[PDB]
Each structure stands twice: as C-alpha cells, then as structure tokens.
Design an enzyme around this catalytic site. Structure first.
Site, PDB file in Angstrom:
ATOM      1  N   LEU A   1       0.826  -1.226   0.000  1.00 41.63           N
ATOM      2  CA  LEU A   1       0.000   0.000   0.000  1.00 41.63           C
ATOM      3  C   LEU A   1       0.847   1.257   0.000  1.00 41.63           C
ATOM      4  CD1 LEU A   1      -2.699  -1.278   2.387  1.00 41.63           C
ATOM      5  CD2 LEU A   1      -2.992  -0.760  -0.111  1.00 41.63           C
TER       6      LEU A   1
ATOM      7  N   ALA B   1       5.003   2.914   1.728  1.00 38.25           N
ATOM      8  CA  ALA B   1       6.033   2.944   2.801  1.00 38.25           C
ATOM      9  C   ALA B   1       6.230   4.370   3.326  1.00 38.25           C
ATOM     10  CB  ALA B   1       7.376   2.381   2.309  1.00 38.25           C
ATOM     11  N   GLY B   2       6.788   4.474   4.535  1.00 42.05           N
ATOM     12  CA  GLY B   2       7.257   5.736   5.125  1.00 42.05           C
ATOM     13  C   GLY B   2       8.604   5.483   5.798  1.00 42.05           C
TER      14      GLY B   2
ATOM     15  N   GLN C   1      -2.457  10.796  -1.083  1.00 41.63           N
ATOM     16  CA  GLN C   1      -2.578  10.045  -2.336  1.00 41.63           C
ATOM     17  C   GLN C   1      -3.740  10.646  -3.125  1.00 41.63           C
ATOM     18  OE1 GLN C   1      -2.827   6.067  -0.343  1.00 41.63           O
ATOM     19  NE2 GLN C   1      -1.289   5.369  -1.816  1.00 41.63           N
TER      20      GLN C   1
ATOM     21  N   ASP D   1       0.961  13.138  15.022  1.00 42.78           N
ATOM     22  CA  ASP D   1       1.377  12.985  13.647  1.00 42.78           C
ATOM     23  C   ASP D   1       0.213  13.187  12.714  1.00 42.78           C
ATOM     24  OD1 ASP D   1       3.391  10.392  11.878  1.00 42.78           O
ATOM     25  OD2 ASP D   1       3.298  12.654  11.645  1.00 42.78           O
TER      26      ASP D   1
ATOM     27  N   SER E   1      -1.190  12.071   4.947  1.00 39.05           N
ATOM     28  CA  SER E   1      -0.989  10.645   4.742  1.00 39.05           C
ATOM     29  C   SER E   1      -1.528   9.791   5.898  1.00 39.05           C
ATOM     30  CB  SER E   1       0.500  10.338   4.542  1.00 39.05           C
ATOM     31  OG  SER E   1       1.175  10.384   5.810  1.00 39.05           O
TER      32      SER E   1
ATOM     33  N   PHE F   1      -1.609   7.331  15.297  1.00 37.54           N
ATOM     34  CA  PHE F   1      -1.466   8.129  16.516  1.00 37.54           C
ATOM     35  C   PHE F   1      -0.626   7.375  17.563  1.00 37.54           C
ATOM     36  CE2 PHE F   1      -5.497   6.247  15.778  1.00 37.54           C
ATOM     37  CZ  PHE F   1      -5.639   5.383  16.877  1.00 37.54           C
TER      38      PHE F   1
ATOM     39  N   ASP G   1       9.299   6.352  21.923  1.00 29.94           N
ATOM     40  CA  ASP G   1      10.733   6.350  22.169  1.00 29.94           C
ATOM     41  C   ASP G   1      11.573   5.698  21.068  1.00 29.94           C
ATOM     42  OD1 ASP G   1      10.373   7.882  24.424  1.00 29.94           O
ATOM     43  OD2 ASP G   1      10.815   6.267  25.851  1.00 29.94           O
TER      44      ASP G   1
HETATM   45  N1  LIG Z   1      -4.891   1.159   6.781  1.00 30.98           N
HETATM   46  C1  LIG Z   1      -4.463   1.546   5.551  1.00 30.98           C
HETATM   47  N2  LIG Z   1      -5.232   1.379   4.429  1.00 30.98           N
HETATM   48  C2  LIG Z   1      -4.862   1.780   3.213  1.00 30.98           C
HETATM   49  N3  LIG Z   1      -3.681   2.372   3.027  1.00 30.98           N
HETATM   50  C3  LIG Z   1      -2.803   2.604   4.072  1.00 30.98           C
HETATM   51  C4  LIG Z   1      -3.156   2.210   5.415  1.00 30.98           C
HETATM   52  N4  LIG Z   1      -2.142   2.576   6.222  1.00 30.98           N
HETATM   53  C5  LIG Z   1      -1.190   3.148   5.448  1.00 30.98           C
HETATM   54  N5  LIG Z   1      -1.582   3.162   4.188  1.00 30.98           N
HETATM   55  C6  LIG Z   1      -0.841   3.719   3.037  1.00 30.98           C
HETATM   56  O1  LIG Z   1       0.503   3.301   3.171  1.00 30.98           O
HETATM   57  C7  LIG Z   1       1.370   4.426   3.215  1.00 30.98           C
HETATM   58  C8  LIG Z   1       2.570   4.163   4.133  1.00 30.98           C
HETATM   59  O2  LIG Z   1       2.220   4.679   5.393  1.00 30.98           O
HETATM   60  P1  LIG Z   1       3.189   5.030   6.596  1.00 30.98           P
HETATM   61  O3  LIG Z   1       4.230   3.995   6.825  1.00 30.98           O
HETATM   62  O4  LIG Z   1       2.302   5.302   7.820  1.00 30.98           O
HETATM   63  O5  LIG Z   1       3.856   6.318   5.963  1.00 30.98           O
HETATM   64  P2  LIG Z   1       3.392   7.856   6.073  1.00 30.98           P
HETATM   65  O6  LIG Z   1       4.512   8.518   6.846  1.00 30.98           O
HETATM   66  O7  LIG Z   1       3.286   8.205   4.601  1.00 30.98           O
HETATM   67  O8  LIG Z   1       2.088   7.900   6.845  1.00 30.98           O
HETATM   68  C9  LIG Z   1       0.480   5.554   3.687  1.00 30.98           C
HETATM   69  O9  LIG Z   1       0.932   6.717   3.043  1.00 30.98           O
HETATM   70  C10 LIG Z   1      -0.865   5.211   3.106  1.00 30.98           C
HETATM   71  O10 LIG Z   1      -0.888   5.679   1.772  1.00 30.98           O
HETATM   72  C1  LIG Z   2       3.752   5.591  18.725  1.00 28.67           C
HETATM   73  C2  LIG Z   2       2.592   4.684  18.480  1.00 28.67           C
HETATM   74  O1  LIG Z   2       1.887   4.220  19.384  1.00 28.67           O
HETATM   75  C3  LIG Z   2       2.380   4.432  17.036  1.00 28.67           C
HETATM   76  C4  LIG Z   2       3.123   5.075  15.998  1.00 28.67           C
HETATM   77  C5  LIG Z   2       2.635   4.602  14.802  1.00 28.67           C
HETATM   78  C6  LIG Z   2       2.937   4.783  13.356  1.00 28.67           C
HETATM   79  O2  LIG Z   2       2.360   4.042  12.531  1.00 28.67           O
HETATM   80  N1  LIG Z   2       3.834   5.671  12.939  1.00 28.67           N
HETATM   81  O3  LIG Z   2       4.208   5.711  11.501  1.00 28.67           O
HETATM   82  C7  LIG Z   2       5.459   6.217  10.986  1.00 28.67           C
HETATM   83  C8  LIG Z   2       5.733   5.651   9.594  1.00 28.67           C
HETATM   84  O4  LIG Z   2       6.858   6.352   9.027  1.00 28.67           O
HETATM   85  C9  LIG Z   2       1.549   3.673  15.222  1.00 28.67           C
HETATM   86  N2  LIG Z   2       0.771   3.022  14.322  1.00 28.67           N
HETATM   87  C10 LIG Z   2      -0.592   3.004  14.312  1.00 28.67           C
HETATM   88  C11 LIG Z   2      -1.407   3.601  15.268  1.00 28.67           C
HETATM   89  C12 LIG Z   2      -2.781   3.468  15.207  1.00 28.67           C
HETATM   90  C13 LIG Z   2      -3.415   2.737  14.162  1.00 28.67           C
HETATM   91  I1  LIG Z   2      -5.540   2.544  14.129  1.00 28.67           I
HETATM   92  C14 LIG Z   2      -2.639   2.129  13.174  1.00 28.67           C
HETATM   93  C15 LIG Z   2      -1.250   2.237  13.234  1.00 28.67           C
HETATM   94  F1  LIG Z   2      -0.443   1.656  12.333  1.00 28.67           F
HETATM   95  N3  LIG Z   2       1.437   3.583  16.550  1.00 28.67           N
HETATM   96  C16 LIG Z   2       0.441   2.776  17.294  1.00 28.67           C
HETATM   97 MG   LIG Z   3       1.453   7.059   8.464  1.00 32.86          MG
END
Ligand SMILES: Nc1ncnc2c1ncn2[C@@H]1O[C@H](COP(=O)(O)OP(=O)(O)O)[C@@H](O)[C@H]1O
Ligand SMILES: CC(=O)c1cc(C(=O)NOCCO)c(Nc2ccc(I)cc2F)n1C
Ligand SMILES: [Mg+2]
Ligand SMILES: Nc1ncnc2c1ncn2[C@@H]1O[C@H](COP(=O)(O)OP(=O)(O)O)[C@@H](O)[C@H]1O
Ligand SMILES: CC(=O)c1cc(C(=O)NOCCO)c(Nc2ccc(I)cc2F)n1C
Ligand SMILES: [Mg+2]
Lengths: 290, 290
Positions: A14, A16-17, A93, A130, A134, A149, A157
C-alpha cells in the site's frame, strides 16, 4: 482470535514511510483483507513486549473517525500492526490524483479530524502527534479516519531517531522544545488543510504571480520559516471567509492563543460544513476510480 | 560475472538506516561473502535504469580507502548495491563498544578519510555528501574505508525526501541552502572526529562538570545550534594541541576559511599520526572481539 505471522498472505504493497512498510494482506483464517504495517526495530526482547502490551489499548479505540484495529504482534525483528484496510488510501494520495481538494470536502475532512482528535483526548487521554494528509485515510463508503497516533509511550521512544527531512507538519513549539501537547495537533491539521486546499505543501507561501498561476528548500531554512516567519494563510478570494478564518485560528504560533478542539467544533466553518449535503463517497470515486 | 537476485543467500542482517537494509550475504556462484544494501524506492522503470547505469562508475572506484564494490542491480522494488563486507563494522558500532576512541587511532582514521575524500575528488570529481561514523567501515586486516558516497545524481534525487531526525553531520552552509560543495565534507569529518574522540554526539557541548565526569534535543534547536552557535571544540588538556587545532580547522563555520583536503594533508596532526606505529588491527579486535 489471535493474529499471527503465518496466518497472513501478502496481496500488494500500500506504501512505505520512515522504517515502516504497509501491506495489503489477507488474513487466511478469517478471510478478511487488512492493512498490515511493519515496523523494523533494533530493540531488546523485554521492551518489545512492553510495546506490544501498550499497543493493546488500540482494541479499545472504536470510533467512526479512527481506523479500525485488529491486533499487534512481533515477528521477524518486525512489529506488526494490523488495521482496517481503507480502499481509498490517504489524503496525500488523494490530493496527488485530484490536484486540489474542494472546500466543501475539506469541510468534511475537518469535521472528521476534529471528531477523531476529540475522541482520542476524551476517551483515551492522548494526542495524535502525527496529523498530516498521509495519516488521514478515506474509503469508498465515504468514511474519513485517523491512523498512526501515538498510543505507546515506549514506541514513541524507539522511533525518536528519525523524521521526514523535507516537509514538516510540526508546530513551532514542538520544533523548538519539549513545551508542547495537544494544541500541537491543531497546528498540523491547519497546515494539512492549507496544503490540501491549495495543491502543494504551503511553505514557502505561493509567489505573487504563482497564485493566479494555480488559480526546493533546505532543512534549516524550512524549519526557520515555520518558527520565525508569519504562518501560511489561504489566498484571499477563492475560499469562504469562514474557512480562511478557521485555518487562521489553527495556525496561530502561540499554542495558548491558538484555537482548541472545543472552539473549532463550534466554528462557523464547521457549523456550515456540518449542514452541507456533500457526496464524499461519490466525489472520491469520481476523482480516483472506484 | 553479473550479480543477480537468485544467486544470493541471506546470512544475517548487518544493520539498517533510512529506507535501506544491509545484509551479510553469500554469493552462491562465487562463494564470496558480501554486504548487500537494499534501497526501496517508488520510482518509474526508466529512471531506475539511469540509477543503475550511474551506479556502474563504482566499478571504477578502486582505492584502499574506499569500500570495494561488486555490482548494482534492480530486483523487487529494490535497488541492490553489493559491496565488500567489512567484518569490523562501522565506527559508530566500534564507538559503541569502545566508549571512546583513542587519539592515536583517530589519527589513522583521519588519514584514511582525507585520503578517501581526495581519491573521490581527484579521480572521480565528486564529494562524499554523507561523512559520518557509520559510513566509515573498518576490518580485521586493519583497513579503514569510506562507503555510501553519492555517485549517482539521480539517486541523490530519489533519496532527497528524508534525513536523520536527531543527529546531523551537515555543515551549516548545507543546512541553510544550496551554496555548498566539497568543503562540506570537511565539516562532517571534523564533527565525527569530535564525537569519536569524546564518546557522544558533541552538540550541545559537554557541560562544565560533565567534562571531568567523562574524564534530549529538538529538531530546530539542534540545527539552530549548528548554524548560529560557536562550533564544538575538543576539551583542552587531554588531547594534543595539534589534534585540537586540526578539528578547529575543520569546524570553521565559513566554508572558504575552513581548511581543505590539501591543507589538512600537510597538517601537524597528520604529519605526526602518519609517522606513528599504531596497531590498528590489534586495537580493533582487543576492543570488539576478533
Ligand atoms: N490502513 C491503511 N489502508 C490503506 N492504506 C494505508 C493504510 N495505512 C497506510 N496506508 C498507506 O501506506 C502508506 C505508508 O504509510 P506510513 O508507513 O504510515 O507512511 P506515512 O509517513 O506516509 O504515513 C500511507 O501513506 C498510506 O498511503
Ligand atoms: C507511537 C505509536 O503508538 C504508534 C506510531 C505509529 C505509526 O504508525 N507511525 O508511523 C510512521 C511511519 O513512518 C503507530 N501506528 C498506528 C497507530 C494506530 C493505528 I488505528 C494504526 C497504526 F499503524 N502507533 C500505534
Ligand atoms: Mg502514516
Ligand atoms: N559493507 C558493509 N560491511 C559491514 N557492515 C556494513 C556495511 N555497510 C553497512 N554496514 C552496516 O550496516 C548499517 C546500515 O547502514 P546504512 O543503511 O548505510 O545506515 P547508516 O545511515 O547507519 O549508514 C551501517 O551502520 C553499518 O553498521
Ligand atoms: C547517492 C548515491 O550514489 C548513493 C547513496 C548511497 C547510500 O548508501 N546512502 O545510504 C543511506 C542509508 O540510510 C549509496 N550507496 C553506496 C555508495 C558507495 C558504496 I562502495 C556502497 C554503497 F552502498 N550510493 C551509491
Ligand atoms: Mg550508511
């Protein structure tokens, strides 16, 4: 039932980040399609179990404004978070295909964000941390939901070590120190709306002639802009006065003067969008293809 | 012979950074052990071939001060760079086990860095762009080598989107704009030496009493420190005057006043370390276990 690694089958990617990939997957035993986020981290066996234990509160997060959660587990140096799959993607997107998001629609996005931040604060006592396009996900049945969140103190951390090196949605107070909290999320939401309203990350602000045209910055330069320069405005004229003022209220540099969730909830722009019969579902497909 | 994906077998993971994992692998047909770096990127088929084509110049990089290169290719949304495996790791890993690196040894590191930057500039007309402890690799036969330099214009591009959100080794001129070039690498090397000399990232500088003790900062705060505050110094007393002056010469904020490669090559600290009979090989194992 308990989710585990061998019960999944990859369907596609889907996106990456930072340090995290997200797969569209099939949960073989249930038949369900999910989004599975993997976070790769060099962490001891003890703290990982804390992380997993802290992630369980997501089972208690149930709101039409918050992405569904299925479960969290640890696998091959990977922490897996399994969520509801949002077939509409994220709003960045969506913005990329749409070019610019209409005001009436941003109205609905704004309500969903405020309602989601409120839910997290009232029921769980946490800030988002955050908010950005995206991390606002949308689907074909018209729903608008927050994801990513910070529920886990310990995960906040182990993830401190990196951030997005171009665009920042961080508030000036958060860019300068520890002295920030929920008000910070208001700033990010405000900035996100401007971006989505306008078609590109709004810092530096559109050039005099670049404005009626629509209608590469360095790290320190960009951050120094957010901290020391006047905040971004919507362009005068093509947006309602109420919208302009709503984002103005969000983008106030001083976090105590800035509007909070309870004031934005009763803001003219929300009162107005809350009345509107907007076919978000129909718009999202008309623009992206569902 | 040509390297391809099915000819490899994973042995273990050497580490990860931003968007890139590094595996210790076996090249099955040759029997050789290599480090294989994978860079995941959302990029069109045309530009990827440019990236691969630009990466071929690494075959022409042959210096005892530059990590060996075996080949580059594209696989599953991944760009693979296959290098010589350095059984000693990087100097940040070394610092982590060693606590603090001795002056005499930093002397050798400094010579290897200067000689490597010189090689890249003289023979290839390129700057490093990412000098830091983790991109200085060492091995059991005592060699000190640079890795992760920017050979590919296009790859520098597709990788612009993120940087390390805590420690920066970027020069003040690079943090502020486009106006930088090779002199920037001098700054990073200088900062790296101080870190390694001292046992931790040197910004903010050690507290008055934190100094004879040895003997959490925000994004903007940290960058604002690098740009607007006096540069870090070695502590007076426990390092030779020549070392102190060498890093002083490296850490001058103005890039034109700062020392360049040709001046550091004939600096007292180098002249001196160049004479010294130092058992780098023996030291590295005595400290890390080989
Ligand atoms: N639950 C989901 N359903 C559909 N697409 C998702 C979901 N979670 C993340 N994505 C897609 O995957 C991408 C990668 O997300 P993430 O690792 O959280 O990077 P970002 O810093 O862009 O949020 C997101 O930009 C979003 O486009
Ligand atoms: C800190 C914390 O609890 C936390 C941080 C993140 C996160 O996805 N950060 O993304 C950075 C990608 O570059 C995260 N993920 C997260 C939180 C809530 C839900 I609904 C889906 C999720 F994938 N958690 C639950
Ligand atoms: Mg994200
Ligand atoms: N050729 C190699 N031999 C041995 N170890 C390596 C090699 N290349 C990278 N590594 C290790 O893998 C880690 C991941 O590297 P990288 O993705 O370049 O991240 P970083 O930003 O830390 O340099 C490096 O810190 C280093 O410890
Ligand atoms: C830009 C360019 O050409 C370039 C950038 C990088 C890189 O590894 N960056 O790492 C960031 C990890 O977070 C890179 N790799 C690279 C360069 C030289 C050698 I010998 C080994 C390598 F792996 N190239 C060849
Ligand atoms: Mg590296």
């Amino acid at each position: 039932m308990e989710l585990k690694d061998d019960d999944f089958e990859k369907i596609s990617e889907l996106g990456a980040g930072n340090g995290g990939v997200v797969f569209k997957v099939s949960h073989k035993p249930s038949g369900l399609v999910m989004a599975r986020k993997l976070i790769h981290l060099e962490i001891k066996p003890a703290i990982r179990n804390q992380i997993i234990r802290e992630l369980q509160v997501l089972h208690e997060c149930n709101s039409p404004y918050i992405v569904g959660f299925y479960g969290a587990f640890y696998s091959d140096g990977e922490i897996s978070i399994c969520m509801e799959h949002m077939d509409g993607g994220s709003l960045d997107q969506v913005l990329k295909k749409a070019g610019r998001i209409p005001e009436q629609i941003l109205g609905k996005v704004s309500i969903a964000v405020i309602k989601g931040l409120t839910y997290l604060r009232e029921k769980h006592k946490i800030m988002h941390r955050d908010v950005k396009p995206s991390n606002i996900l949308v689907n074909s049945r018209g729903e608008i939901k927050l994801c990513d969140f910070g529920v886990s103190g310990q995960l906040i951390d182990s993830m401190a070590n990196s951030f997005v090196g171009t665009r920042s949605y961080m508030s000036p107070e958060r860019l300068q120190g520890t002295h920030y909290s929920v008000q910070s999320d208001i700033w990010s939401m405000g900035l996100s709306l401007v971006e989505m309203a306008v078609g590109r990350y709004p810092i530096p602000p559109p050039d005099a002639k670049e404005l009626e045209l629509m209608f590469p910055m360095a790290i320190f330069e960009l951050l120094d802009y957010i901290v020391n320069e006047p905040p971004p405005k919507l362009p005068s004229g093509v947006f309602s006065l109420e919208f302009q003022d709503f984002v103005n209220k969000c983008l106030i540099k001083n976090p105590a003067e800035r509007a909070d969730l309870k004031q934005l909830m009763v803001h003219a722009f929300i009162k107005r969008s809350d009345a509107e019969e907007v076919d978000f579902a129909g718009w999202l497909c008309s623009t992206i293809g569902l």
